[PDB]
Amino acid sequence: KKNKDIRIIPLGGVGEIAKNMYIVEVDDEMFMLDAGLMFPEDLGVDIVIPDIQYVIENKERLKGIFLTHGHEAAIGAVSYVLEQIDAPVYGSKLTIALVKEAMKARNIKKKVRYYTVNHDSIMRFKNVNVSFFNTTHSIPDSLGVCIHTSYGSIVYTGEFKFDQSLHGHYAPDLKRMAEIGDEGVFALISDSTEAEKPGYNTPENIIEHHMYDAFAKVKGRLIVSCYASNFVRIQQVLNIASQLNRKVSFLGRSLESSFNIARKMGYFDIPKDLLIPINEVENYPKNEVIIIATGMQGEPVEALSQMARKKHKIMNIEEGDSIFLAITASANMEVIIADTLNELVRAGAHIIPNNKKIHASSHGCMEELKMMLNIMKPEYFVPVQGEFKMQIAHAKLAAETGVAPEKIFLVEKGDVISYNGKDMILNEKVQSGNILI
Ligand SMILES: [Mn+2]
C-alpha cells in the first residue's frame, strides 16, 4: 500500500558504544530493531539498558522486535523489554537460540512468540514487509533488516564488516544487498564503530596466519585472551591448536553460554576430543595445551592480572608461560593492559608481541562502510552505533558516496526523524535514557 508517514527513533547506540536499539514507524506500525545493553562507563558485574517508556506509551502498535545478531549489544535488553511488553521476537537460528538462553538464565517462564528468520524470509505486516540479508561479523548468523515501504527500503545493517576470507555462516549477501540497492533504499542505518579508522580491516585469514607463526615458536604453555563475543577468533585458535598437536581448555569448569550453545548447534569446527577440561591440564606437558581466557568487558585482561599476580581461583601463571592478547586496545582499557603487562613480566612470562600493522575489528573501517553505502545508494542516511565523532566520520563517507549532505542526519538518543512524504525533518524529541540494573 501507499505509506504516508515514516519515523525513525534511536533509543540506544548513538552517542555511545553498544546498546543498539532503533525504533522505526511506518504509519501505525512500529518496529524495534535490536535491543542491546551496555557495560557502564569506565566496575564489572552490572548492566545498562534503554528507556522504552515511549514504546510502552505506544505498545499497541509494536508489531515486533528484530535482532541482527547474538551479541549482548543486540539482544542484551530483550528479557527486560519482554517484562514490560509482549511482542513477537524475530532473529536468526543462533540469535533466537541465545535469547532463549538469556530468558532461561533469568528463570523467566513467561512464554514468548519466537520466529526464526533467514536471508530468504519475508515477514508480512499490514502496511509493510520486512526482509533480511546476511552480514559479515564476529558472530555467525548475523542479519541486516529491510523494511519495505512505498518511499523505499529502510535498511538497518546491524554491526557488520566486509572480509574476503569469511565464507560460511559469516558470508555476506553481495547479491540481495545489490537487489535492495536497485529496488531503492529510502534510509540506511549503518554501523559507525570504526568510521574513524581509514582503509580496511586486516582479513581474518591473515590474522590467523600471523597467530599461527607466533604460536609455532612457543616452547612452553600458551595462554590466549579473547572476548567471548568473538567466535571467529575462538575458532581460529582451535584451528591452530589442531595444527600444532596442542589441546584447548577454557577457563572455568563450565564452558561459556554463548559458545557452548553455538558449539552444540554445530557452528564451530572442532576435531573430536580436542577440548581438555580445565581439570585435566596438569596431565599434559606444558607445550601441548592452549588455555583460552574469555570475557565480556575487560575480564579477559582482568583474568591475566589474577593469573600472574598468583591469586586466580582456578589456575595461575608459572615462569616460562607465553601470553597472547587477542583483543584490540581501545583507549578505555589501554591503562589496565600496560599494568597487566608488567604483572605478567614479573611472573616471568613471554609476551607474544602484538603486530602493530594489524587492525582487527568486528566492524568495517572507512572503506568497508563505503562498500555498504555504494551498494545501498540510500536517499537518506543515519549513522548509528558510535559516539558523536564516530557518527560524524561515517556521515562524511556518506557524502563522499554521493548521498545528499542535507539528507544525512546525526541524532542523539530520543531524536525523531519524520517524513511527511515531501521533506524529512527533525522536529520532535521523545523520552530516552540509561537504566542501570
Ligand atoms: Mn557485535
Curated annotation (Swiss-Prot):
Q: What is its main location?
A: cytoplasm
* GO biological process, any: rRNA processing
Q: Per the record's keyword annotation, is Coiled coil included, yes or no?
A: no
Q: Which UniProt keywords apply?
A: Cytoplasm, Endonuclease, Exonuclease, Hydrolase, Metal-binding, Nuclease, RNA-binding, rRNA processing, Zinc
EC number assigned by the record: 3.1.-.-
Its top-level enzyme class, in one word, is hydrolase
- Cofactor comment: Binds up to 2 Zn(2+) ions per subunit. It is not clear if Zn(2+) or Mg(2+) is physiologically important.
Q: Could you say which residues bind substrate here?
A: 359-363
* Necessary cofactors: Zn(2+)
GO CC terms, sorted: cytoplasm
Annotated residues that bind Zn(2+) are located at 69, 71, 137, 159
Q: Per the record's keyword annotation, is Nucleotide-binding included, yes or no? A: no
Question: Transmembrane region positions?
Answer: none
Question: Which cellular compartments is it found in?
Answer: Cytoplasm
Mind listing the GO molecular function terms for this protein? 5'-3' RNA exonuclease activity; RNA binding; RNA endonuclease activity; zinc ion binding
Disulphide-bridged cysteine pairs: none
The role this protein plays is:
An RNase that has 5'-3' exonuclease and possibly endoonuclease activity. Involved in maturation of rRNA and in some organisms also mRNA maturation and/or decay.
Record text on subunit structure and interactions: Homodimer, may be a subunit of the RNA degradosome.
The text of the family note is:
Belongs to the metallo-beta-lactamase superfamily. RNA-metabolizing metallo-beta-lactamase-like family. Bacterial RNase J subfamily.
What is this protein called in UniProt? Ribonuclease J 2
What organism, scientifically named, is this protein from?
Staphylococcus epidermidis (strain ATCC 35984 / DSM 28319 / BCRC 17069 / CCUG 31568 / BM 3577 / RP62A)
The upper taxonomy is: Bacteria, Bacillati, Bacillota, Bacilli, Bacillales
Quote the gene name from the UniProt entry.
Answer: rnj2
Q: Span of the full-length protein shown?
A: 6 to 444 of 557
